[PDB]
């Protein structure tokens, strides 16, 4: 209870600064006019673009990752007007989890959705036009023009789409006597940037510098077309950027269309841009607008903490540190051997290394004999696409397999796409629908804690747990809360159906060894006594579309099971509670990996969450029209009807089985400024969470970690990121000692935090 | 062969519904009772099966596992020219490693084979005519009735 105290009393100065930062009116002339964004649309190339200042404010919340910086965000949300966003979908869901654990937070989306990022922008040439900054000292106008030229192929499209959409909106209400506060409510589906000027971007170090200006730019857009009351009040955006500046980095990928060499360079993140740019540190006044959270809560060690301090603050590496980290070094052939460290996540510094490691363990488990099962993943290229693109690349000679030499990464979610063991691509022309299709096999493991990568639609088919676990679900109605408060009737219908379907399970437990004849006699006798105040008999299920029905018909079934669970719980003591209770709406038989959910009826249709830790179960086919929302896309929809698409089944933390949909992703990049839908990749998009790259590890914390370090490529920032993903130093093993080997340390942002920790106007929260 | 959902309203007991979960062969014994009642004892559990040499299959498809073979089989039933094996999984084809001898010749030594339990024996007709036509399947022409008569002595 005393843990929150420091945050509780130190976030108040933060709150008492963001308020004046958000309630500061700009001069009339400094407000970006609508005509500005009209001219931006007219401009074709980002060269004649006029030097235009877009005013903004910042407030920086830095601090160790997992330093509980979210308490500050929590206090901000419940006190201030704010639009909470996230740099990654995982981070956005993590903030939602930690904001709805205290009060109500509206669905937290990504900043990309907030400024209008759509599908076609994903693969867009974001680094093309040049800029010779008339700078040193770099004017803010020049920096903003650089960040708009960087994102010309995104800023221009956003401006054009927003502008050419037409005017009503707030313009209408404002003239009530010529009430815009009640305008976003009455006029719905309006962009969330029209109702607040405090934009919280969490884990903002995962965003490049180009985005910062972009966000501000977009803010003004969405407040100019709609003529928001904030625009009439001459308010300016304030970007509360929350993230770890020394545990997070942003990378830019460019693909050269002749060499087929996809390159990824390092970039300046928003945090580093704001901390280390003399122009932004003055305009935004970071000295009076910086909060550093300094405590590592999860950590409960002492020497582990000192090492984190020296690595994060750039302190000199001493002999004692070398001797401490010496106790973690385990051989190269010990980490890579799958027989060792079971259940420990293994980090490598190369995607090829992860592709090697995942394959060897697959062989190990398969030979030793979970189940190493094989599941189809396909691809769909088209003849016209690879005809025209080959024409435009100045090289019309290129084989399709050579097309898939590197664009397989750039055809779907990169993370799992380049970190999966898979077969040989069977690229066969299926031009029936004018197409050429590929076919490989992404072997998984059976019954492992896998994670959903992309956005999937979960369809819960039932619960495979214990009688006690299902009694708990009904008692607290936790399941109902996961579906949201606006549509509770749908959640109550399916639970009702389950209870009327799971009555047979009690009768199987009736056949349990070690029970007296009269013990079972009293069992069935109390079953009869409860039927007297209720045997399945012939209960009439179902209800009309009425709110009262799901609070009367369900109320009976909820009380029926609750009682029934608790009834036999007392009769058989702990044995009944631990007994496995499986409830499904259909005859579900699961021999080996293959499952069979018969014919679905879409009793409860929901959306799987990426953060939710699921468990791989098996690939039932049971073609559901719920996932078959297929409408190019129809040409492959016909083939998906042809070849039965397998729907992989996952088990959530509670234990409810959920059948999910597949994933489809486009590749559109070109060089002739002709973005055309080339290839759509149909696969599963699940990750093992057992092996990954250090760079991706930055995003999410891990329980047990074994780090495989490649010598020569040793960057102390990578070592710090890898070693900081786990709370306890006890469960940490490593290839070599990053402190004892030659390491390229880049301690430039470290001294900047140190000078920030050495400034009277910077607020440090313990 | 009967399809589970086609017989979902049948309300059968255990062993008589899980055998036909995807589709399952049922050995129906037709006959009379001594009092003249026409009976049809629907026998369950009988599966058609064949053998392939263990080393030969291990080589020609690196089937480093009995189930790795089942995957190659279902991959073939997916590539099937016309969509007769929809949904087929790695569990319709249970297999084990048996220690049998080819009847041909006396010098023959008892090798290691895989005994591959098909269900729905028309899939065995495919997996016998189209699966790796350079490996030698042994008893893939023996229908499920003969497996029923022979496997049960008497």
């Amino acid at each position: 209870a005393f843990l929150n105290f420091t945050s509780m009393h130190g976030v108040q100065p933060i709150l008492k600064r963001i308020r004046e930062l958000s309630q500061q009116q700009l001069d009339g002339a400094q407000v970006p006019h609508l005509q500005w964004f009209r001219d931006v649309a007219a401009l074709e190339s980002p060269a004649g673009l006029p030097l235009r200042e877009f005013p903004f404010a910042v407030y920086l919340i830095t601090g160790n990752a997992g330093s509980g910086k979210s308490t500050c965000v929590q206090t901000i949300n419940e006190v201030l007007d704010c639009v909470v966003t996230g740099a990654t979908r995982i981070a956005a869901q993590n903030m939602y989890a930690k904001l709805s654990g205290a009060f109500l937070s509206r669905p937290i989306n990504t900043i990309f959705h907030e400024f209008g990022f759509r599908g076609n922008h994903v693969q867009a040439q974001l680094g093309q036009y040049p800029y010779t900054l008339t700078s040193n000292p770099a004017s803010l106008e020049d920096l903003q023009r650089r960040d708009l030229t960087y994102y010309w192929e995104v800023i221009l499209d956003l401006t054009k789409r927003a502008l050419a959409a037409s005017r009503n909106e707030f313009r209408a209400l404002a003239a009530l006597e010529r009430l815009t506060r009640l305008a976003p409510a009455t006029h719905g589906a309006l962009p969330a940037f029209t109702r607040s000027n405090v934009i919280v971007i969490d884990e903002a170090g995962l965003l490049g510098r180009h985005l910062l200006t972009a966000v501000v730019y977009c803010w003004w857009m969405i407040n100019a077309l709609y003529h928001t009351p904030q625009y009439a009040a001459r308010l300016r955006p304030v970007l509360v950027c929350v993230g770890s500046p020394t545990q997070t980095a942003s990378l830019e990928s460019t693909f050269e269309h002749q060499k087929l060499r996809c390159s990824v360079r390092q970039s300046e993140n928003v945090l580093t841009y704001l901390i280390c740019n003399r122009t932004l540190r003055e305009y935004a006044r970071l000295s009076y607008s910086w909060a550093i959270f300094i405590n590592n809560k999860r950590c409960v060690e002492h020497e582990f903490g000192n090492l984190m301090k020296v690595l994060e603050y750039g302190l000199p590496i001493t002999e004692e540190h070398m001797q401490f980290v010496d106790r973690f070094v385990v051989p190269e052939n010990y980490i890579t051997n799958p027989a060792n460290l079971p259940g420990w996540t293994r980090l490598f510094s190369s995607h090829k290394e992860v592709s090697a490691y995942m394959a060897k363990l697959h062989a190990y488990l398969k030979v030793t004999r979970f189940v190493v099962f094989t599941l189809p993943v396909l691809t769909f290229v088209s003849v016209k696409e690879f005809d025209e693109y080959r024409r435009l690349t100045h090289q019309p000679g290129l084989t399709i397999e050579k097309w898939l030499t590197a664009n397989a990464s750039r055809i779907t979610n990169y993370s799992q796409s380049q970190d999966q063991d898979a077969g040989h691509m069977r690229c066969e022309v299926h031009s029936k629908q004018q197409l050429v299709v590929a076919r490989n096999d992404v072997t998984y493991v059976l019954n492992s804690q896998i994670a959903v990568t992309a956005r999937l639609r979960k369809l819960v088919f039932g619960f495979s747990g214990t009688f006690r676990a299902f009694e708990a679900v009904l008692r607290d109605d936790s399941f109902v809360k996961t579906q949201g408060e606006t549509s509770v009737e749908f959640a109550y219908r399916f639970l009702s159906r389950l209870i009327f379907s799971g009555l047979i399970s009690f009768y199987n437990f009736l056949q349990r060894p070690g029970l007296d004849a009269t013990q079972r006699t009293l069992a069935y006798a109390r079953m009869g006594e409860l039927t007297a105040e209720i045997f399945y008999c012939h209960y009439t299920p179902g209800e009309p579309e009425t709110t009262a029905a799901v609070h009367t018909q369900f109320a009976l079934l909820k009380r029926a099971f609750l009682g029934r669970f608790r009834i036999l719980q007392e009769l058989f003591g702990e044995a009944f509670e631990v007994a496995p209770f499986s409830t499904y709406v259909d005859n579900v038989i699961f021999r080996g990996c293959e499952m069979l959910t018969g014919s679905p009826r879409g009793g409860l249709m929901s959306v799987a969450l990426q953060t939710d830790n699921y468990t791989l179960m098996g690939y039932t086919y049971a073609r559901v029209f719920a996932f078959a929302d297929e409408l190019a896309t129809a040409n492959v929809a016909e083939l998906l009807e042809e070849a039965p698409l397998p729907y992989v089944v996952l088990r959530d933390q509670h234990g409810f089985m959920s059948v999910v949909n597949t994933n489809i992703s486009e590749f559109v990049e070109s060089i002739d400024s002709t973005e055309l839908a080339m290839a759509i990749n149909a696969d599963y998009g699940i990750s093992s969470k057992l092996a990954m790259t250090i760079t991706r590890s930055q995003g999410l914390s891990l329980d047990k970690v074994a780090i495989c370090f490649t010598p020569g490529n040793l960057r102390l920032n990578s070592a710090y990121v890898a070693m900081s993903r786990t709370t306890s130093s006890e469960f940490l093993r490593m290839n070599l000692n990053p402190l004892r080997e030659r390491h390229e340390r880049d301690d430039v942002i470290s001294e900047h935090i140190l000078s920030a920790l050495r400034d009277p106007n910077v607020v440090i929260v313990y | 062969v009967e399809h589970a959902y086609g017989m979902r309203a049948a309300q059968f007991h255990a062993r008589f519904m899980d055998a036909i979960t995807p589709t399952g062969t049922v050995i129906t014994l037709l006959g009379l009772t001594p009092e003249g009642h026409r009976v049809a004892v629907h026998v369950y559990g009988t599966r058609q099966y064949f053998y392939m040499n263990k080393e030969e299959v291990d080589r020609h498809l690196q089937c480093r596992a009995p189930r790795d073979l089942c995957e190659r089989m279902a991959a073939a039933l997916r590539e099937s020219p016309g969509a007769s094996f929809r949904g087929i999984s790695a569990d319709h084809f249970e297999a084990e490693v048996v220690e049998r001898t080819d009847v041909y010749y006396y010098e023959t030594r008892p090798a290691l084979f895989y005994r591959v339990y098909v269900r729905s024996g028309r899939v065995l007709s495919y997996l016998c005519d189209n699966f790796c036509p350079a490996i030698k399947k042994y008893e893939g022409g023996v229908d499920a009735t003969t497996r029923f008569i022979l496997d049960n002595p008497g």
């Binding site: 005859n587 038989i589 | 519904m17």
Partner: peptide, 24 residues
């Protein structure tokens, strides 16, 4: 495996007819 019988095959012979092809 979950099986609840409370959650069959069609006869493909003429049990009824109301129209046919009168040849005689």
């Amino acid at each position: 495996n979950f099986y609840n019988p409370y959650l069959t095959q069609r006869h493909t012979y003429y049990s009824e007819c109301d129209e046919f092809r009168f040849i005689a």
